[PDB]
Amino acid sequence: EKLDFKITGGWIIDGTGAPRRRADLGVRDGRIAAIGELGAHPARHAWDASGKIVAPGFIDVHGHDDLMFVEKPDLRWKTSQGITTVVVGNCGVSAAPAPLPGNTAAALALLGETPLFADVPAYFAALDAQRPMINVAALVGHANLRLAAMRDPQAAPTAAEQQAMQDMLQAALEAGAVGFSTGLAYQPGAVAQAAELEGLARVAAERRRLHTSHIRNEADGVEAAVEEVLAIGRGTGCATVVSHHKCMMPQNWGRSRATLANIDRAREQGVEVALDIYPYPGSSTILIPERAETIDDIRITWSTPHPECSGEYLADIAARWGCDKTTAARRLAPAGAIYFAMDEDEVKRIFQHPCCMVGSDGLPNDARPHPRLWGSFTRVLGRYVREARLMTLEQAVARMTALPARVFGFAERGVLQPGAWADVVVFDPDTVADRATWDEPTLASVGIAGVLVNGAEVFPQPPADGRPGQVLRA
Ligand SMILES: [Zn+2]
Numbered sequence: 001e002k003l004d005f006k007i008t009g010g011w012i013i014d015g016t017g018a019p020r021r022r023a024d025l026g027v028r029d030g031r032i033a034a035i036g037e038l039g040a041h042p043a044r045h046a047w048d049a050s051g052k053i054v055a056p057g058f059i060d061v062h063g064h065d066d067l068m069f070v071e072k073p074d075l076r077w078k079t080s081q082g083i084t085t086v087v088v089g090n091c092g093v094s095a096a097p098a099p100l101p102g103n104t105a106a107a108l109a110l111l112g113e114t115p116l117f118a119d120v121p122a123y124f125a126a127l128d129a130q131r132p133m134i135n136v137a138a139l140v141g142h143a144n145l146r147l148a149a150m151r152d153p154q155a156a157p158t159a160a161e162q163q164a165m166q167d168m169l170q171a172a173l174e175a176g177a178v179g180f181s182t183g184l185a186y187q188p189g190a191v192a193q194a195a196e197l198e199g200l201a202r203v204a205a206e207r208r209r210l211h212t213s214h215i216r217n218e219a220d221g222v223e224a225a226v227e228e229v230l231a232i233g234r235g236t237g238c239a240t241v242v243s244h245h246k247c248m249m250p251q252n253w254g255r256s257r258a259t260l261a262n263i264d265r266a267r268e269q270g271v272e273v274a275l276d277i278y279p280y281p282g283s284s285t286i287l288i289p290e291r292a293e294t295i296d297d298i299r300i301t302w303s304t305p306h307p308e309c310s311g312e313y314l315a316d317i318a319a320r321w322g323c324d325k326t327t328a329a330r331r332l333a334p335a336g337a338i339y340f341a342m343d344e345d346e347v348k349r350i351f352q353h354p355c356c357m358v359g360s361d362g363l364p365n366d367a368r369p370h371p372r373l374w375g376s377f378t379r380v381l382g383r384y385v386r387e388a389r390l391m392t393l394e395q396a397v398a399r400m401t402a403l404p405a406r407v408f409g410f411a412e413r414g415v416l417q418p419g420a421w422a423d424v425v426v427f428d429p430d431t432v433a434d435r436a437t438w439d440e441p442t443l444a445s446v447g448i449a450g451v452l453v454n455g456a457e458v459f460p461q462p463p464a465d466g467r468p469g470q471v472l473r474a
Pocket of ligand 1: 090091
């Protein structure tokens with residue numbers, strides 16, 4: 001039977017960690033139909049991967065693209081760096097459920113302006129009707145749960161409200177969500193205590209779903225923050241993921257030796273724990289005035305009242321206005337910024353941890369976004385692998401494909417084997433690299449030759465009509 005697609009002459013890195021091998025890949029009906037010698041096998045479409053690596057499409061485990069499938073459907077920032085699947089709904093904020101009227105959170109800005117969906121069924125229904133460019137898996141945000149269940153999201157939950165959040169989570173999981181996420185460093189999630197988080201974790205654990213977490217603090221209290229989420233995992237048995245693990249500010253550089261040691265103690269005990277990072281020593285999120293005098297070079301990524309300030313340093317803005325930085329930060333609100341506060345050598349060491357995946361944490365609606373939006377995966381392949389030799393290409397690809405599939409429960413994805421979905425990326429190992437910079441954060445990567453999502457090409461030429469992405473219902 002004729003193949004729908006075939007990629008020949010290249011070297012296959014299947015995601016299992018096994019050594020790259022010279023073989024061709026055949027696709028039919030959206031799945032990998034065969035692997036081996038296909039030179040003379042007829043196919044509707046064919047790519048010459050000579051001198052290239054053929055690997056499973058990359059899985060971005062830390063996306064905030066929840067509302068982009070409707071707002072900016074091209075998702076070019078993902079496809080251009082080899083991403084074929086994204087896990088959205090991170091750091092406590094998700095597309096659904098919708099908050100109670102009048103309930104809001106600054107962190108919701110990490111998603112966009114599109115009105116949130118009533119519930120996961122509605123969100124997934126919207127995605128089925130308007131298929132995404134790439135595959136989409138979704139987490140339900142703890143912030144959403146609180147904002148949807150509590151008349152006063154700043155208080156302690158009543159027994160009924162706690163049960164309401166658990167029931168909302170249960171419904172989301174039954175609908176296909178892969179778990180729930182927390183944003184303990186943000187309001188209103190920060191108000192939550194152990195009992196509240198454990199309750200949700202029990203619901204997730206019972207269904208073998210995840211608890212991903214943007215921990216309480218990633219600076220002076222980073223060790224306590226990691227211990228807090230590990231305690232929840234050890235007590236409930238809920239699989240856990242520590243989002244964009246890092247140590248902010250010089251006095252905290254190196255503390256990942258302690259946090260990773262704690263993570264290791266937890267996984268040795270049987271708790272499923274993983275983590276992820278983006279390959280940059282600067283973070284990016286909402287502008288926090290309390291950091292005005294603790295971190296230098298705070299650079300604005302967006303500002304509703306002062307859009308002219310995107311790309312500018314808080315200190316320069318303050319000096320120009322004749323006020324202090326904290327005051328300037330308050331006048332810029334609501335806004336976002338980049339915080340250059342990590343040690344690149346530490347980011348690299350964290351990535352080397354056996355359970356570390358890659359999460360771009362791109363913020364698609366920012367006027368002047370952090371470059372991780374467009375160059376995370378290719379920066380790992382070019383800077384961390386080819387340049388720094390932190391691990392082999394085979395090992396790195398595994399971190400971007402098979403490991404995420406294992407952690408998030410994606411059957412028939414993340415590996416190049418017959419029968420699995422044909423999410424594939426073809427790239428030149430010697431040239432693959434990010435081009436997005438701090439000044440020009442939207443420059444596309446180089447070295448990515450082609451990308452297939454469920455057997456259909458999305459890069460370099462995206463589909464004219466319906467897109468090939470699927471909602472990955474757990
Ligand atoms: Zn986060």
